[PDB]
């Protein structure tokens, strides 16, 4: 049965693509999570830079 056989091949690709869509939906959620974490990381890095600038000023004036 040749029609049934090609249909089985289409069904096999469809099954892999269905899983690929499920997994790319999960990836999008994991990316959203990571984006929020990296936004917070960027803010934290600003605090670190600001505090380090203030300390460099302090030690510059301590040493004339």
């Amino acid at each position: 049965d040749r029609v049934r056989n090609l249909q089985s091949e289409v069904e096999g690709v469809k099954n892999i693509m269905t899983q690929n869509v499920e997994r790319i939906l999960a990836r999008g959620e994991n990316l959203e999570h990571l984006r929020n974490k990296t936004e917070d990381l960027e803010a934290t890095s600003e605090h670190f830079k600001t505090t380090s600038q203030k300390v460099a000023r302090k030690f510059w004036w301590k040493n004339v």
Partner: protein, 58 residues
């Protein structure tokens, strides 16, 4: 043979492939935003490290 049944299956497959492609493309901005946030953070941490290194020499 009745081959028209194969058309419907391929329409379904085509929709999955198109949906997949739209989803991958829709996630581009999240990936670019992550990369940009990390790039900014890395510049800031490098600059902070350099300021501490200067203070360590004064």
């Amino acid at each position: 043979e009745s081959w028209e049944t194969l058309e419907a299956d391929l329409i379904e497959l085509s929709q999955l492939v198109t949906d997949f492609s739209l989803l991958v493309n829709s996630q581009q901005e999240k990936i670019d935003s992550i990369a940009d946030h990390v790039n900014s953070a890395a510049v800031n941490v490098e600059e902070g490290t350099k300021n501490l290194g200067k203070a360590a020499k004064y």
